[PDB]
C-alpha cells in the first residue's frame, strides 16, 4: 500500500526563505517561521492566512507549539528565543543566554520547559513562566542542529555538525548516551519516535537513520533523496500508514515506507530546497516549506 498525497493549497506570504512549518497539537493551525523575521499563522485545513507575529530583530530558523496550542517559541539569529501568546500575537518573554544564532527549539509535553540548541554549541533548558534559563548543557563541539523532548519530557535528544546525537536527563542535565555511527557525518536532524523508544536522525550524506538509542543500534536506513547542505526536518507520519516524510535539496518531498525503507512517493511542486515538512496530528495532511527562490508553503492531502 502507498499514500496518494496531492497538492491541495499553496500558502504565499513570506518575503524570504521559509525555515520551519509546524501544526498546532489541536490540528487547527499551521505556524511558519522565516528569514523575513516573521511568524505566520494559517488554517491547517484550508491554508487561510490568519495573522503575522513580529518582534525578532533577525531571521528565524525554527518555531514550535505548546501542548495546549496557545503558545509558540521561535529560535532566532538575533541570539534569542521568544515565547508568544498566539491569540494576541504578543511576546510574553525573550529568552536570552546564547552567544550565537539560536537554531532549534521545542516545548516539553507538559509545556513548562523549553529546550533550545545553538551555533554557540550548547543546549539550553528554559523556564516558560519566568523566561529564565534553568540549565546550560555543554552539549557539543559544533553547531546544535536539533533538540527534541521525549514522550514524558524525561529525556532530550540533541544533534550536531560534530557528528553526534546525545540523550540527556532533563532533571539532572546529565548526558546518558552518545550515539556513534561507525562514521562521523554532520547530524542535521534528530527526533524521538512518538513512543520515545527510537530516534530518527538525518545526516549530511543523503541518509536518514532510525536508531534504537538505548541499545545504540540502527534498525532502518532511508536514502534516495538529496541532503548534504541543509538541516532538513524529517517526520514520522502515523495518521494512516507508517511513513517517513522528509524534504530534500532536489525540491521534492520524499515519503518512505517505514518498514520496507522503499520510496513510496516524491511530491513535486516546490522550486527550491524543501527545508521543512510537518505531519498533521489527526489527518493525513503534510505541510512542506521551501527556501529563498520559492518562499511558499504547500498543503498536501492523502486518503491513507
Amino acid at each position: 500500500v502507498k499514500p496518494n498525497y496531492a497538492l491541495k493549497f499553496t500558502l504565499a506570504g513570506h518575503t524570504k526563505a521559509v525555515s520551519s512549518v509546524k501544526f498546532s497539537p489541536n490540528g487547527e493551525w499551521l505556524a511558519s517561521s522565516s528569514a523575513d523575521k516573521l511568524i505566520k499563522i494559517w488554517g491547517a485545513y484550508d491554508g487561510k492566512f490568519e495573522k503575522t507575529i513580529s518582534g525578532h530583530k533577525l531571521g528565524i530558523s525554527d518555531v514550535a507549539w505548546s501542548s495546549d496550542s496557545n503558545l509558540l517559541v521561535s529560535a532566532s539569529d538575533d541570539k534569542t528565543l521568544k515565547i508568544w501568546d498566539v491569540s494576541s500575537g504578543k511576546c510574553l518573554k525573550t529568552l536570552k543566554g546564547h552567544s550565537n544564532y539560536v537554531f532549534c527549539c521545542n516545548f516539553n509535553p507538559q509545556s513548562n520547559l523549553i529546550v533550545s540548541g545553538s551555533f554557540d554549541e550548547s543546549v539550553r533548558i528554559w523556564d516558560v513562566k519566568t523566561g529564565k534559563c534553568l540549565k546550560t548543557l555543554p552539549a557539543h563541539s559544533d553547531p546544535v542542529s536539533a533538540v527534541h523532548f521525549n514522550r514524558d519530557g524525561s529525556l532530550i535528544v540533541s544533534s550536531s555538525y560534530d557528528g553526534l546525537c546525545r540523550i540527556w536527563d532533563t532533571a539532572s542535565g546529565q548526558c546518558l548516551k552518545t550515539l556513534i555511527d561507525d562514521d562521523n557525518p554532520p547530524v542535521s536532524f534528530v527526533k524521538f519516535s512518538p513512543n520515545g523508544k527510537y530516534i530518527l536522525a538525518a545526516t549530511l550524506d543523503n541518509t536518514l537513520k532510525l536508531w534504537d538509542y538505548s541499545k545504540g543500534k540502527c534498525l532502518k536506513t532511508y536514502t534516495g533523496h538529496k541532503n548534504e547542505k541543509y538541516c532538513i526536518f524529517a517526520n514520522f507520519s502515523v495518521t494512516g500508514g507508517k511513513w517517513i516524510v522528509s524534504g530534500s535539496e532536489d525540491n521534492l518531498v520524499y515519503i518512505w515506507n517505514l518498514q520496507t525503507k522503499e520510496i513510496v512517493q516524491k511530491l513535486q511542486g516546490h522550486t527550491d530546497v524543501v527545508i521543512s515538512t510537518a505531519c498533521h496530528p489527526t489527518e493525513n495532511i503534510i505541510a512542506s516549506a521551501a527556501l529563498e527562490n520559492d518562499k511558499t508553503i504547500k498543503l498536501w492531502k492523502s486518503d491513507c
Binding site: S193, N195, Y198, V238, Q259
Partner: peptide
C-alpha cells in the same frame, strides 16, 4: 523485521 514506533508500553 517490523519496528513499532507508536506503541507506548
Amino acid at each position: 523485521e517490523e519496528v513499532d514506533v507508536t506503541s507506548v508500553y
